[PDB]
Design a protein around this ligand. Structure first.
Ligand SMILES: CC[C@H](C)[C@H](N)C(=O)O
Ligand SMILES: CC[C@H](C)[C@H](N)C(=O)O
Lengths: 182, 182
């Protein structure tokens, strides 16, 4: 038998500004229900992606084909018991070189294409260095994301709240500092 | 208000063989329902620990006092929203230096002290370099753990199955290889 309710994918995307947005553009108007990443390698980022399905294995195959035809390396984890039980809860670590990060929590209304619309709303001026999101089937999705400071303080807590997305600065969070910062 | 159902703790323990077992000995006959770790720093390991409570904040305080009196550095994350929503699902990463690991899945019967009994049953001959466990309130707890090879192939799949703990070798798992191995 095969998992029918969701596609679980290990995707490599470029470790550069705007790469998450470009990848989600290809996913398009789908219900992307998980997206987990933390800066590790400076060239290739590793993302754990979950997509809710309505047409089961065939739809999983269509997504895999689309991503390959788009030039992405993807490993299908949909039938992988350790991915389903453990590894989707283990995307983290400290970065391979020291980062100067700002951490924020956000909420976005859930519907097909919502993660894509949220990533576009953030924009690509700052590099995303951490992302954690899992849908709970609720009306709003809850995201944790960090951004590299670069040359200007990220503006998310002003701009995103002006645009109808809840946003809070979490940079001094003790759990982030203990397990993830570096 | 305060969280009453569980204590969530960020604990530093020595990065050495037998350290997890020694820490869980101090926790004793408690319902340890989460224990997440991945080798990072070679001196100090960082563990995310959850303990189910029956006496709420007072019991949380008793656990914190006991751990401090035992000489452990602990940060209380029980009321930390980002820990509860995100970071407990983000304990992972690749190790700070390359490791030669063997990965196994296990199941143990859930009851007070069960994680302690499982860690003692494993023994301390091999260093644990990865641990993921979250209780789902079910009769059996499901663990993912990796061990450094050292000088002898770990014996868990023979010995632990002889002792009434289910154990399977997962060393070639694609999700581990993609997100955690290093
Ligand atoms: C997942 C984030 C990716 C890799 C990239 N850093 C970005 O800012 O889009
Ligand atoms: C969590 C594992 C700890 C740090 C240690 N490596 C052990 O084998 O007990």
């Amino acid at each position: 038998s095969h998992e029918q309710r969701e596609a679980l994918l290990a995707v490599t995307i470029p470790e550069e500004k705007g790469s998450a947005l470009k990848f989600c553009q290809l996913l398009g108007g789908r219900s992307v229900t998980e997206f987990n990443y933390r800066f590790a390698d400076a060239k290739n980022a590793c993302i754990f992606v979950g997509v809710r399905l309505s047409r089961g294995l065939e739809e999983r195959k269509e997504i895999l084909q689309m991503l390959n035809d788009g030039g992405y390396s993807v490993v299908d984890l949909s039938d992988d018991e350790m991915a389903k039980l453990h590894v989707r809860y283990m995307v983290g670590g400290r970065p391979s070189h020291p980062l100067q990060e700002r951490l924020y929590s956000f909420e976005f209304p859930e519907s097909p294409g919502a993660l894509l619309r949220f990533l576009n709303t953030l924009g690509t001026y700052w590099n995303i260095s951490l992302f954690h999101y899992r849908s709970h089937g609720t009306d709003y999705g809850r995201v944790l994301a960090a951004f590299e400071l670069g040359d200007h303080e990220p503006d998310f807590e002003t701009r995103l709240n002006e645009l109808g997305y809840d946003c809070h600065d979490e940079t001094n969070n003790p759990a982030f500092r203990f397990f993830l910062a570096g």
